[PDB]
Symmetry: D3
Subunit: 305 residues, 6 copies
Amino acid sequence: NIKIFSGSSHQDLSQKIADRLGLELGKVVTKKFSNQETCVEIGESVRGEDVYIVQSGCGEINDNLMELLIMINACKIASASRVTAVIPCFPYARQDKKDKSRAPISAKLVANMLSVAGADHIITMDLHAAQIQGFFDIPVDNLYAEPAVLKWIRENISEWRNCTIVSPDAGGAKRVTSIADRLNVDFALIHKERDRMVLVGDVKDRVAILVDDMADTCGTICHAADKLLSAGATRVYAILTHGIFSGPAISRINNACFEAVVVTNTIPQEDKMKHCSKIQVIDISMILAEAIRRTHNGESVSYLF
Amino acid sequence: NIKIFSGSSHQDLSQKIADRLGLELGKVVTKKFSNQETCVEIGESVRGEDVYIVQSGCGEINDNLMELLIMINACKIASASRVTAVIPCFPYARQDKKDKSRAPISAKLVANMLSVAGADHIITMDLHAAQIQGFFDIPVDNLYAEPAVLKWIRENISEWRNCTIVSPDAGGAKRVTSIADRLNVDFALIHKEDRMVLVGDVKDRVAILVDDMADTCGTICHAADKLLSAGATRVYAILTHGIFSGPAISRINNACFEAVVVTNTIPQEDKMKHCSKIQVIDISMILAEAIRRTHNGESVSYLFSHVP
Amino acid sequence: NIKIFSGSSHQDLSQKIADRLGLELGKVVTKKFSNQETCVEIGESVRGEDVYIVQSGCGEINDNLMELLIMINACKIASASRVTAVIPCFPYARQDKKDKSRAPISAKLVANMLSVAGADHIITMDLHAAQIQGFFDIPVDNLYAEPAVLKWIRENISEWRNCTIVSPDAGGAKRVTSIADRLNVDFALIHKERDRMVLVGDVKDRVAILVDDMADTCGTICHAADKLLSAGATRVYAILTHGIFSGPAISRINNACFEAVVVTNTIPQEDKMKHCSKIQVIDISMILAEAIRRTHNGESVSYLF
Amino acid sequence: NIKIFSGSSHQDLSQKIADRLGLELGKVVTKKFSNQETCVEIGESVRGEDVYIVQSGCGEINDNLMELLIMINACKIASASRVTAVIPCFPYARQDKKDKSRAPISAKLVANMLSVAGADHIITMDLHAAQIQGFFDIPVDNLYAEPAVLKWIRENISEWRNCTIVSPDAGGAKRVTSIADRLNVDFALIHKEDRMVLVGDVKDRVAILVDDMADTCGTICHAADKLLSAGATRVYAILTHGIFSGPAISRINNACFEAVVVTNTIPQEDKMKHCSKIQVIDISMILAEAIRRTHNGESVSYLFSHVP
Amino acid sequence: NIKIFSGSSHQDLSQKIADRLGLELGKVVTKKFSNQETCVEIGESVRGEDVYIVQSGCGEINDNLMELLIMINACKIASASRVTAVIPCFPYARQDKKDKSRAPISAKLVANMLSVAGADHIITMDLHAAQIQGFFDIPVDNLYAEPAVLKWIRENISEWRNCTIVSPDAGGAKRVTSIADRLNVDFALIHKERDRMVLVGDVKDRVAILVDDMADTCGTICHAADKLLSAGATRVYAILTHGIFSGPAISRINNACFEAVVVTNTIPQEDKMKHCSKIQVIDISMILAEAIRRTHNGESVSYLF
Amino acid sequence: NIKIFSGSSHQDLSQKIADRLGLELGKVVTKKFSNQETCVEIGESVRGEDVYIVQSGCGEINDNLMELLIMINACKIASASRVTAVIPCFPYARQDKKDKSRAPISAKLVANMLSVAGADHIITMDLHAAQIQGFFDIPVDNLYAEPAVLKWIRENISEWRNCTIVSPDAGGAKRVTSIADRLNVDFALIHKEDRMVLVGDVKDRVAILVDDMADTCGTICHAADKLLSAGATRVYAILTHGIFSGPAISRINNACFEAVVVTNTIPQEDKMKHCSKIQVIDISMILAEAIRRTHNGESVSYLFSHVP
């Protein structure tokens, strides 16, 4: 009655999820045409079934989005009973406001494409902005890596009782104060004179944990680390839920005084972990598997929060 | 071929806007029942016209919202060419996320209600969260009171070049860092844990609490004490939307504020009578200009950093 | 699997319905903000459930409507399987046509808001105009108080065999002729020179029963009564399904020669019944409970007609 | 930049309207199959233009409806700037409620079909029930034949100042009381139980049966007898829509009517040949005016109580 | 739980389908008003049921379409759980493109009307163009008569091993090459100088089987037959899935050298078969019944392909 | 009040179109990330304007599609009066049916994406299947390269009056019979079973393979051999959309083609450098004209059989 499919080369996360649920990934034929034009073909019947498609992790964001939309469309017209998009890292989530410009609100375009593609429900983790849930009319379940992060902080950082949760920018305030409140420690924030960086909050003679929802080139995260050192920080960690490590990223964190860099399984990290030793990954496949099972059985998903 | 109508008897703001455009407000016959069931009738033809309806300032948010929706409906089925909702202070804006609870995203519901009611365009000031524009599919022009605030500051605070812009909560960091950078001064943030914590330099400086709105004012009043305790010379509070419900007025009269500044996105006259610490910045010209430019198809972005 | 929630202070009707169904009302947190801004929070999971929200009866029509829409939205995004709005007295139902004016068709605005809020089905009683069912694309079940009214007329009025069903205005013709046909008696109608009132039909030397779907200030209903007396009516009753008694209402019916005024439970009457003795209420909670149960079990609801 | 097209060969009404606007009807190539499958082709460009399609009077309601929908579709995908459906007599209008049965609300389905077909505006005359405007989300202008009826009455019935306007059923009370009040005379109502009952004064007065439409005329014919039996001097019947299907014509030729008056919202020529009691009120000018004003963005409400 | 209704006078196909499923056709009241205005009334409850309405076969295409839409609407607002339109011969399917004219895409108008009427799923046979499935957003299952046609060709035509599948026009190329490939024979195509007819492909001294999705007046089909004869064809058959035989049709095929004309049950043929002997019908009721049963039980429908 | 913008740096076609209209391309600030996440910013106001966005020729179809959708979104929420998507070569057009498989109808998904993105009108050239217009509800103008092809033929092939127009597959019969009839010559069709079969007269005649698009060219290359083997004098291949991915170029350089002709609906410069058998027909004037007429509300059908 339940069916789980995956997209593109990536299958690590999808395979983990399927295993935890005691299922095999559904059969899906995929042939890439001329100019990356995506071809997808559901290798089995999904008629009357509760379908879950897990987003691929093949870097190319536009090929991934299209493959996901095409799969959703194929299942829908193949009379699937319900289609849910499991998207650990919501694409274009950062493009969620005009920001004083003649810019697109791409995250809303995406929510609309997903909806028109035929998605009936969304399962994602740590939306860049909680307001994005409102970009849909269909139900969205936004999971959190926070519990896992807190737990990891307590078990791997000895001086955590007196550490400081630091935000790379002004926009991450709420995220770090929330984590800082749970741990009962101090918080601090860095801001790039929008240039030089300014820091508010107490980090002197104590471990500084940089927390952010995501990191790409890691330019910011690496500069914030140097700043924290100059501020007299003991050791600076960097915890991200989504590790879009790209470009300089790999070399940057190595050449950075990061004691360690923790990221989740929301994006493939096997390739980068090899060329970067200070990187550790928190597996969130169990959380995702549990939300699917609970969504299917109609049980509480908020429990995982 | 422009037509401007006002929500209810609170013509106040809507009449200033109309004056600035060289127009009179459109005729609207409004009958109301005991259960507050709103009756509306457009007293003039709006056929083929560019209509603007400015939300009333009554105070009762559900009556005002329904009256706005009803007027939009009436104009749309009366063949208005276009209907724009001018909503200075967006209703339910603070209810824009589930926040880890089985809560409604009321701001999204409101956007959908305005949409199905027949709204073709929205004009508002300082949405509680910029992401709210994404709750609509129709175009939204979110005007800023910033230019007017930066001007009030430069013109009313002698020490502005050495002041600190303070956010009353963590969520406002971006807004204050933004004003601090334009002015080239320090910024600071207050985070409520039931204890307030302050990060940022305010010692021997004038502290300016800046936020989008103030309701019961319990937060800004407490932040002010915190700031003085931290060595601030004097404290100001500048919010774009002055709700001031409940004990706010009494709370402000007893607070150590040098002054509390708000725009007139919400009627402030009654409140001022009982509170002298309040000063109002008029934003009718900014709204009047967005409407005029919207109608003429001219740039409205000019208003984001320019006081007409 | 089934869940029933109620809104605002009112809970009399909702509690009766829940009891008849052997259920407790679902947990819903409610805190009213500054200017009556409505805050609602579903106190329990409704994921995969058949949900029924019963409209509150706290007079303020706009606060009631909003609270209902907000509750519907919260349940919908909380992954409820289906949401049904049980609205005994459909708000703005009288505003269902332009009527030769540049007026809104508010009843349609409401149907649209309800639909966009996420309602999948509507259960109401005695719609002001049957055409309102067409203002929705979703299924609407319009229940009738008629059977109960007829029954009440037979058991409480001795001279009913030869009474006259009277309509307060020209617009209630169909309503009274239908009831008059079932009882096999005469019908009459009153009209305000649209002023003085005119009456057509035979009421001389016989009990006159004024029937209408609703009454607010009761100005009309009270004038029609005086008229009926001058016409030589024996005794004049007034039967309404929706008793929006407001303003003068209470005092008016007392100072009116009404033998009795019968209304249904669709709107709270406990407060007004105290200051008005000639008022009797027909409880329709059983009818509503039965339509919900039948809607849930997929059984015939028309049976209740 | 206005374009008017006719449903089918029943140019009749559509040609009068066109004449009154100083226009010719647009070219339309129409091919039809044996199974009545309608083929349509807009013989001229409608790109960027204000299009009006007037429903044909063929008689076969489903063929006419489909032909109308098809033409609307063709114009819309051919980039017409706006497409208005001019439907004098709204199809399935009598099917506007479930009426306690597991019935379809066909009038709502029709409104949805016209909407999805691409209609941006509707112009009709005397909807069977005003609530029908609410079946659409697009604007609807529901014109009244009342002004024309009140004029025919004042001009054709000597005793109009002492006549009685009678409704053939309970549902028409509002419509007759409305005409009775404007004229300042009595009104009466007939209710069918299989026996008719009459309430209202008709004794020694001219009785005018007024309704929105007459089909088989079984009702108005029986009401007329009832009225004469009640002491009416003579009986008239004035309906806006003259369907006259089945035995209607034979039924009218044998009825005690002084005359039967209808508008030309439906072709009446063939019917008149076999029935001399029929007289037609031309409403083309009223429709032509609503179109002209719709196009110019001018008040159409003027027509509700004024015969152009 | 499952309910099958039929429309208008036609009930042959609908009755066959119901029998194969072991059911009686649902009760539906139908009274035709003045000018063919369609009146429909569901004679039984369909609340919470999986409903299937089979299109009538009463020639008048517009009365049939409307009756179908009206039935769909009535079931939908009567709280039916799901409504599926079973339409063997999709109306206006040939009007599926502008074709270099200011023409309507009627097939899309129809798909939209069906959708707005409330249809949740479509079951049809041999769509004039497969692209029409894309005119809907709802699931469409397009069945094929091909298997049955091939089978019939093998059992009724002795020289089939060396016959030629002929297309009446250029537009039927794909249809005939597909059938010709399955049988492993030659294909040919005829074209009207768009006049005289041209023929490409080898038909000399061999049976010619004209294949087309539909035939109305049969003008084309009959001319193609004469052409095939002049080309030196042994015997010319004509196989159509949809036999819209109208106008001259009946007389035309008789006066035509057609060895035989095969058509399916998608349209009533009992009346025409009497006045035309060379006509044979392949019953597709079992195929339709099987798709309904499979759609209801959530089993594979593609199996029938 | 017309505004034309280009998808990406592949201004090529979009710049020619702009030149032909006497305009410059609108300013667009485009930032792109490593994961190819597209960032766009309209560098000028489009408020109340008629906007045209011409899809880029980058090559990566998903990046180009997303960039197009994003730009449409940005313009729409920036209050453009109308936004038209000029898509010379429609993405996923070949994926327009299930074809007896549990496949997606990607061309329909793309139409829906463009619709919800906010597209009000589509302008494309030679949709793979005319039925694709029906995948939208908004108007679509599907331009033909035929007039330009018929002209290239008459002007470049001496024997055109005695040539044969050949379809590389069964599905193209209609398209070739159509060109064959206008020219008044023979036609032929090739059907791939893994063996090609040819029906039609090509003996001693110049054979012109005509199709809407050519990708890997495996088919046209094989069809050419087949044609020469059948007695064709020489073979040509004329496709409107020149994809030429994979081994196409190498495949064409080794094929027995006299020449391979394509339009510039897709950039062809890089391909031409490595392939001299390729010749390009410029269709910018045809696209420029459709835009100009679309904007002025003038007939665009004129272009279906007339080379501007």
